[PDB]
Design a protein around this ligand. Structure first.
Ligand SMILES: [Ca+2]
Ligand SMILES: [Ca+2]
Ligand SMILES: [Ca+2]
Ligand SMILES: [Ca+2]
Ligand code: NA
Length: 483
């Protein structure tokens, strides 16, 4: 059966501490609709209870130690998360944990550090003489003590930070120590993009490297994780991420599927990351997201024949996780670039019914986003579920592509003899509707097919040769399958 990932959170998921309970409760629904793996938000204690997890304070605190004035994380307690995972597993759904290793946030105290400022546009350039700062680098874990790990962090485990408590100024500070330098290889944007936010981990420090691998193995074993989602990969030494994934696989003996968030609309840079990590991990198909977003925003003017241009799925399908939107691209967020609602079902058809790539459904698209703009994403589950059913029950067999018109494009799947009544014919259009003759396999001759989305009520009969004349409404999607 085809695999389908679900990102199970959005930016505005509530800080009610009930998200793991929500997931546990949704396990049956997710398995029923065909989700086979869930990517959960960072599960460890952030700089505050309300942090989404991307400002992690203590990786070893999964919502079980009193730190930051709370036991639970934003999402709930450790036991609640373990219950959610147990429910998913009972329904043959896997769980991928989010791994936030770039930086640490929320230090317990400052320390005196010799530092230099660097150019924000070229971090390889020092722009001040050395001076003393007070940086937030002492991480002591007062509520955990030595439980699980007696490692304590200090300035020297980091390459830099962006705040000096002495002068109360925000700059990119690079620390001075013994052979300190920004890590390589990382994205070359801004000269060296090792530094992003908070206190940047130094992946040159041998103790840090060993400790982080130890943590990775611990985290997998503690939650019985089936794989990982790596946050902010372009800001972390690539050979380190390569080795870290391998270390966890060696210890567990498990596949440990991993997808990295390498946030760059550049297929060539994404391919470089794949090479530098020995093709041991997938990447999100950032270019495809941007293409889909472009099509959704040009009011019909986008050349739909070009949807696959420059995408990772077109070049390294087996290493691509395709997606429509995420918590960073949703309205009001840092990488805001939302696929417009009218086009969203078309985009889901594109990632869920095509043969290549590992598609990811976004919780915010299914259930809606709860931000404060007058342009939040509505709950589109009623439009995505039919497309998920198309994936689960019909998207099998040989695929034929029809990227042959500036608005109306489509593809078919012939079905597989081992999946009863499988096969489909999909059409999408960014402009006025119309028709397209497409081949669905001579073995489907004479069959009555119908649009599983309900957008069109008229059935299509496959002729004696395996060709059907399919129809799509304007700015819409139709996916035809056996009646
Ligand atoms: Ca370094
Ligand atoms: Ca970094
Ligand atoms: Ca067009
Ligand atoms: Ca058939
Ligand atoms: Na670093």
């Amino acid at each position: 059966v085809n695999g389908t990932l679900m990102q199970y959170f959005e930016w505005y998921t509530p800080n009610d501490g009930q998200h793991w309970k929500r997931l546990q409760n949704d396990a049956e629904h997710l398995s029923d609709i065909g989700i086979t793996a869930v990517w959960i938000p960072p599960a460890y204690k952030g700089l505050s209870q309300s942090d989404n997890g991307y400002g992690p304070y203590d990786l070893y605190d999964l919502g079980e130690f009193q730190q930051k004035g709370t036991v639970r994380t934003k999402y709930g307690t450790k036991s609640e998360l373990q219950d959610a995972i147990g429910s998913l597993h009972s329904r043959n759904v896997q769980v991928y944990g989010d791994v936030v290793l770039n930086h640490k946030a929320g230090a317990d105290a400052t320390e005196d550090v010799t530092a230099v400022e660097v150019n924000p546009a070229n971090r390889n350039q020092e722009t001040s003489e050395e001076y003393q700062i007070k940086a937030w680098t002492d991480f002591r874990f007062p509520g955990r003590g030595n439980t699980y790990s007696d490692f304590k962090w200090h300035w020297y485990h980091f390459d830099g930070a962006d705040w000096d408590e002495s002068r109360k100024i925000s700059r990119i500070f690079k620390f001075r120590g013994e052979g300190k330098a920004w890590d390589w290889e990382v994205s070359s944007e801004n000269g060296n993009y090792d530094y992003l936010m908070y206190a940047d981990v130094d992946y040159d420090h041998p103790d840090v490297v060993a400790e982080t691998k130890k943590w990775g193995i611990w985290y997998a074993n503690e939650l019985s994780l089936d794989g990982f989602r790596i946050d902010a990969a372009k800001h972390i030494k690539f050979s380190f991420l390569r080795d870290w994934v391998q270390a966890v696989r060696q210890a567990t003996g498990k596949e440990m599927f991993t997808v990295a968030e390498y946030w760059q609309n550049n297929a060539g840079k994404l391919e470089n990351y794949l090479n530098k990590t020995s093709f041991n991990q997938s990447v999100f198909d950032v270019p495809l997201h941007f293409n889909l977003q472009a099509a959704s925003s040009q009011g019909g003017g986008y050349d739909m024949r070009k949807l696959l241009n420059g995408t990772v799925v077109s070049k390294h399908p087996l290493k691509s996780v395709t997606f429509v939107d995420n918590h960073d691209t949703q309205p009001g967020q840092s990488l805001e670039s939302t696929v417009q609602t009218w086009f969203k079902p078309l985009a889901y058809a594109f990632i869920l019914t095509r043969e290549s790539g590992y598609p990811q459904v976004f919780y915010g698209d299914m259930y809606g986003t709860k931000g404060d703009s007058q342009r939040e994403i509505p709950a589109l589950k009623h439009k995505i579920e039919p497309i998920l059913k198309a994936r689960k029950q019909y998207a099998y067999g040989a695929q034929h592509d029809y990227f042959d018109h500036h608005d109306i494009v489509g593809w078919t799947r012939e079905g597989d003899s081992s999946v009863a009544n499988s096969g489909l014919a999909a059409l999408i259009t960014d402009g006025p509707g119309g028709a397209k003759r497409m081949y669905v396999g001579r073995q489907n001759a004479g069959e009555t097919w119908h649009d599983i989305t309900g957008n069109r009520s008229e059935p299509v009969v496959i002729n004696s040769e395996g060709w059907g004349e399919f129809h799509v409404n304007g700015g819409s999607v139709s996916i035809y399958v056996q009646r």
